[PDB]
Design a binder for this molecule. Structure first.
Ligand SMILES: CSCC(NC(=O)Cc1ccc(-c2ccccc2)cc1)C(=O)NC(CCCNC(=N)N)C(=O)N[C@@H](Cc1ccccc1)C(=O)NCCc1ccccc1
Length: 215
């Protein structure tokens, strides 16, 4: 159980992406976690398609630009046997017709693992699996305008998370934080990342809906 962890240092994370004005955060959180597992498997990091998730994962329960869950995304990837790369199926920040094409699938999983709802549990998955999809309460103006530092919202709900994101590690400043990759672009926060209060009673419920695909 290491002191600090940062999967960006090992080539597991793709650059920061932008969901644009579309409620497809679940999809970016999903591709993020998937991108990291495939890497741990094949050794190759390849950006995955969120538009692929937004357009065809309705059967599993997702609502495209109107909402979804990372697990419905892993499930879709499981029932569909594959997922098209980002290049092949570019992102358009809007719901289009399903255009999946097996010829371009570059990833796949065989389920997912819902992590026990405890921060200590999240810490081990992060330390021993890689980037983890999680959901936090980001419905506060302070989060939207987070610039840098360790984010702490004494108004954050640990039960009503509304934003899916990617935990890429954790550490502490010379005070413990979770390293989180957001999908609002690199202009947001610290190059698109945020350091969130760690071991502070599941702040914003970050450890309450953690999960990752099994490839
Ligand atoms: C504060 S940002 C929240 C959010 N995002 C958005 O609503 C949209 C949004 C998109 C881009 C920017 C943006 C800002 C600056 C620069 C560039 C872009 C801002 C907001 C969202 O709620 N997304 C949804 C759909 C809307 C739900 N209800 C509501 N707003 N009142 C979403 O699906 N969130 C997931 C998160 C989550 C994932 C996994 C576990 C727990 C929670 C969710 O709530 N999922 C559960 C609900 C659902 C399930 C199936 C179909 C539809 C909805």
């Amino acid at each position: 159980a290491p002191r600090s962890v940062d999967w960006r240092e090992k080539g597991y994370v793709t650059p920061v992406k932008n969901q644009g004005q579309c409620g497809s955060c679940w999809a970016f959180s999903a591709t993020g976690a998937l991108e990291g597992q495939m890497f741990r498997k094949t050794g190759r990091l390849i950006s995955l398609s969120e538009q692929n998730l937004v357009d065809c994962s309705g059967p599993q329960g997702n609502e495209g630009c109107n909402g979804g869950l990372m697990d419905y995304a892993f499930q879709y990837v499981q029932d569909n046997g594959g997922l098209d790369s980002e290049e092949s199926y570019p992102y358009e920040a809007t719901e289009e017709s399903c255009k999946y094409n097996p010829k371009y699938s570059v990833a796949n999983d065989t389920g997912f693992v819902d992590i026990p709802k405890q921060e200590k549990a999240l810490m081990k998955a992060v330390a021993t699996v890689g980037p983890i999809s999680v959901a936090i309460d980001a419905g506060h103006e302070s989060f939207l305008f987070y610039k840098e530092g360790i984010y702490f919202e004494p108004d954050c709900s640990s039960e009503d998370m509304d934003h899916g994101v990617l935990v890429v590690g954790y550490g502490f400043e010379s005070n413990k934080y979770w390293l989180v990759k957001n999908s609002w672009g690199e202009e947001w926060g610290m190059g698109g990342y945020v350091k969130m209060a760690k071991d502070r009673r599941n702040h914003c419920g970050i450890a309450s809906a953690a999960s990752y695909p099994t490839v």
